[PDB]
Amino acid sequence: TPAFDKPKVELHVHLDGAIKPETILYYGKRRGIALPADTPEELQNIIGMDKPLTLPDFLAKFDYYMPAIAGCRDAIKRIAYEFVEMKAKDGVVYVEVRYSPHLLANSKVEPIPWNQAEGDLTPDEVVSLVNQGLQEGERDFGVKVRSILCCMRHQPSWSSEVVELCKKYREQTVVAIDLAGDETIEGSSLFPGHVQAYAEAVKSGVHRTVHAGEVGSANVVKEAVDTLKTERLGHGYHTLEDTTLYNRLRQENMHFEICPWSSYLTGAWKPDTEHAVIRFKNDQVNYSLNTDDPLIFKSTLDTDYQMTKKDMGFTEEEFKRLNINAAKSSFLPEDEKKELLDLLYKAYR
Numbered sequence: 001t002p003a004f005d006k007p008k009v010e011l012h013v014h015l016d017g018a019i020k021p022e023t024i025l026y027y028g029k030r031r032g033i034a035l036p037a038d039t040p041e042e043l044q045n046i047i048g049m050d051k052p053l054t055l056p057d058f059l060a061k062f063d064y065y066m067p068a069i070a071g072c073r074d075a076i077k078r079i080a081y082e083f084v085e086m087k088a089k090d091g092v093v094y095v096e097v098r099y100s101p102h103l104l105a106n107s108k109v110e111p112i113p114w115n116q117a118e119g120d121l122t123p124d125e126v127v128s129l130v131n132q133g134l135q136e137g138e139r140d141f142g143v144k145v146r147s148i149l150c151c152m153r154h155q156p157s158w159s160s161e162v163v164e165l166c167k168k169y170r171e172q173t174v175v176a177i178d179l180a181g182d183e184t185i186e187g188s189s190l191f192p193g194h195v196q197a198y199a200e201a202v203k204s205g206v207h208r209t210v211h212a213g214e215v216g217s218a219n220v221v222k223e224a225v226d227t228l229k230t231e232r233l234g235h236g237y238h239t240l241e242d243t244t245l246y247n248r249l250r251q252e253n254m255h256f257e258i259c260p261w262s263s264y265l266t267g268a269w270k271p272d273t274e275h276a277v278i279r280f281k282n283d284q285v286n287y288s289l290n291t292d293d294p295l296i297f298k299s300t301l302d303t304d305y306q307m308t309k310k311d312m313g314f315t316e317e318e319f320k321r322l323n324i325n326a327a328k329s330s331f332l333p334e335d336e337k338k339e340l341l342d343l344l345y346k347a348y349r
């Protein structure tokens with residue numbers, strides 16, 4: 001069955017939304033936290049969506065389940081270990097996984113997230129434990145894995161710590177900074193704390209992506225490219241509403257991190273219309289296909305491949321092309337990136 005039975009690369013999935021029902025049930029059982037249920041069965045149904053909803057309804061599900069992992073070392077490392085596992089099972093041979101370290105912390109972070117009480121699990125420590133689990137997981141399951149730390153739109157006060165974290169754990173497994181959250185917050189791309197993190201990212205050679213043009217305007221994409229200097233875009237769909245920016249980004253070979261099934265469920269893409277990625281396939285744009293939050297969207301990577309193959313007539317050699325384009329726009333050392341590409345061009349023959 002699976003739409004594209006071949007090796008894959010994925011650049012855009014978030015750890016905190018790539019968590020198995022059963023491990024959430026586990027941890028908060030053992031924690032006293034509790035949940036809108038206690039089978040890892042009915043759990044999936046309530047956290048998963050089948051339908052667009054508002055942002056509030058979206059965020060409150062991080063509020064049921066986050067409190068179960070966040071704070072608990074064991075649970076941080078574990079979720080990252082078995083993240084890699086999921087990807088092995090998608091046939092992925094390289095994945096960049098992203099998250100905010102503050103959002104799993106319980107100590108040395110204000111405000112403290114998720115109505116947690118203060119503990120002594122700090123963000124820097126978060127990174128450490130994530131690292132271990134992905135690294136150990138790379139070892140056990142045969143998928144090359146790096147990670148990306150997210151600043152969050154609404155709290156520019158955390159972004160200098162993000163970049164510093166990026167520089168300290170640099171490719172142990174951190175390779176890039178990201179900007180995630182509510183991208184409609186008025187002027188958020190230009191908050192000095194964000195701007196100055198991304199400038200220090202240029203100064204110290206840390207790679208840069210930015211979620212933009214998902215649910216914001218094409219002015220948000222422009223700000224990500226021109227001011228934050230990003231190298232790739234998260235989603236970027238609304239780029240198409242500004243033609244000269246579109247055309248320049250095609251000429252510059254900008255990579256767009258597309259998340260198709262994501263884009264139905266979040267409202268990004270409105271189903272009476274054109275999918276965005278269809279335009280990009282016809283224009284030979286540099287983009288990849290990605291899942292974002294499989295937990296929440298009920299999905300695996302094959303989901304997004306089936307959607308494009310079935311609803312959009314994507315073909316095998318288009319799936320090949322974009323995975324090559326994903327590996328080319330990855331944030332690895334150039335030596336490792338060529339090694340990637342060799343693996344894949346071998347598999348595709």
Ligand SMILES: Cn1c(CCC(=O)Nc2ccc3ccn(CC[C@H](CO)n4cnc(C(N)=O)c4)c3c2)nc2ccccc21
Nearest residue numbers: 014016017053054055058098099100181182183215266293
């Ligand atoms: C508008 N909209 C967005 C756009 C993205 C958005 O606003 N996200 C957002 C906003 C504020 C917060 C505050 C915390 N988070 C979660 C952070 C974590 C960090 O790794 N995370 C995990 N997944 C996402 C994501 N898909 O946006 C972000 C936020 C995430 N996501 C939606 C999903 C269902 C329905 C509507 C949606």
Ligand SMILES: [Zn+2]
Nearest residue numbers: 014211234292
């Ligand atoms: Zn995302």
